[PDB]
C-alpha cells in the first residue's frame, strides 16, 4: 500500500554469476533447500547447454525469449463488473514470469527426475514447443481479445 | 475446592507415608527377581489409598486440581494473582 519496497537484491549466480539465473534457482528451490536446487538447475542447465552447444546462459536466454509475454490482463472491478483489461508487462516481470512458468510446467512433465524434465522443457521453450510457451500464447491471446478495453 | 475433597487429598497423603513409604519396597523385594512371589504379590491388598500415584496436588491456596505448578505449589491462577503483589521472590513479567 502506502509502502514502497522494491526489488530485494539477490545474490549472484555461484557457478556463473548472473542475477537472473540466481532467482531462477530460487523459483525452483523448495523448502529452503537452496543446495538441492542448484544441484538440479546446473545438471539440467548442462545437459541442455551441451546439445545447444552454446554457453548455458545463451541456450537459457533463447529458451526464455519464447516464453516471454509482453502484455497480460489485469483484473479490474470498476462498475459492478470485473472487466479484464490487458497491459504491457514491465521488463523485470517478463523474465520472472517466464522462469516461473518454465519450472511450474517442467515440474509436472511426468519424466523421471526433475533435472531431466527441466532440461527438456527448457529446450522445447526455445522453439515454442513445450508448455511454457503455451502459457504465453493463452495469456497473450487473453489480451487483444480484450483489446477493446485496452 | 470442595471442602470434602480438599481433605480427601490429605488422607491419601498420610496413608502413602505411614505405610508404603517403608512398605511399598516389597515390589523390588519379594515382588522382584530374587527368590516374584504370588503370595507376597497378593499381600499388597490392604492399603490401597496408600499408593503415591493417588494425589492431585491441588492449589495449596485454593485447590484447583488442574492448573498446577510444582515449583510454586499453587494453581495457575493464584500464581499470577500473588506474583503480581510481589509475594513470590524473583518472579516477574518475562520478555525477550
Amino acid at each position: 500500500r502506502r509502502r514502497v519496497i522494491g526489488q530485494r537484491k539477490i545474490l549472484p549466480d555461484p557457478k556463473f554469476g548472473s542475477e537472473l539465473l540466481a532467482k531462477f534457482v530460487n523459483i525452483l528451490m523448495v523448502d529452503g533447500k537452496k543446495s538441492t536446487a542448484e544441484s538440479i538447475v546446473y545438471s539440467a542447465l548442462e545437459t541442455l547447454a551441451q546439445r545447444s552447444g552454446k554457453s548455458e546462459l545463451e541456450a537459457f536466454e533463447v529458451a526464455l525469449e519464447n516464453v516471454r509475454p509482453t502484455v497480460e490482463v489485469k483484473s479490474r472491478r470498476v462498475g459492478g463488473s470485473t472487466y479484464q483489461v490487458p497491459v504491457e508487462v514491465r521488463p523485470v516481470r517478463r523474465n520472472a514470469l517466464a522462469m516461473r512458468w518454465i519450472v511450474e510446467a517442467a515440474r509436472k512433465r511426468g519424466d523421471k527426475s526433475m533435472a531431466l524434465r527441466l532440461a527438456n522443457e527448457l529446450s522445447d521453450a526455445a522453439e515454442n514447443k513445450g508448455t511454457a510457451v503455451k502459457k504465453r500464447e493463452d495469456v497473450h491471446r487473453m489480451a487483444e481479445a480484450n483489446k477493446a478495453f485496452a | 475446592a470442595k471442602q470434602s475433597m480438599k481433605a480427601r487429598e490429605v488422607k491419601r497423603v498420610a496413608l502413602a507415608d505411614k505405610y508404603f513409604a517403608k512398605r511399598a519396597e516389597l515390589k523390588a523385594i519379594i515382588s522382584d527377581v530374587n527368590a516374584r512371589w504370588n503370595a507376597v504379590l497378593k499381600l499388597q491388598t490392604l492399603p490401597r489409598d496408600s499408593s503415591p500415584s493417588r494425589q492431585r496436588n491441588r492449589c495449596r491456596q485454593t485447590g484447583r486440581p488442574h492448573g498446577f505448578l510444582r515449583k510454586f505449589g499453587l494453581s495457575r491462577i493464584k500464581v499470577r494473582e500473588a506474583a503480581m503483589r510481589g509475594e513470590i521472590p524473583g518472579l516477574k513479567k518475562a520478555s525477550w
Binding site: - | R36, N38, L41, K42, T45
Partner: protein, 79 residues
C-alpha cells in the same frame, strides 16, 4: 494383557474361587474384580462380573483363561 511376569488378580476372587474348587460348582460369584485374569481352577465355574449396571453370569472355559473376567462383560449399551 501386558503384565510382564505375573498373572495378577484380586485376592477376593482367589479365596472365594478356591472354595469353589473343592465345594464344587454352584451359585455364581458376585465379583467386581473384572480386572483379574481367569485361571484354570475356576475353569467352567459359576462367576459374576459387574459392569456399571449389575453382574453377569460369567463361566470360565478352556482357552478362556489368560484373559480378564472383564473382557467378557460388555459395559456400554449400544442399540
Amino acid at each position: 494383557r501386558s503384565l510382564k511376569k505375573g498373572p495378577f488378580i484380586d485376592l477376593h476372587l482367589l479365596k472365594k474361587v478356591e472354595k469353589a474348587v473343592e465345594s464344587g460348582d454352584k451359585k455364581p460369584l458376585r465379583t467386581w474384580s473384572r480386572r483379574s485374569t481367569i485361571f484354570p481352577n475356576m475353569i467352567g465355574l459359576t462367576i459374576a462380573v459387574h459392569n456399571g449396571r449389575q453382574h453377569v453370569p460369567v463361566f470360565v472355559t478352556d482357552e478362556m483363561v489368560g484373559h480378564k473376567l472383564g473382557e467378557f462383560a460388555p459395559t456400554r449399551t449400544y442399540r
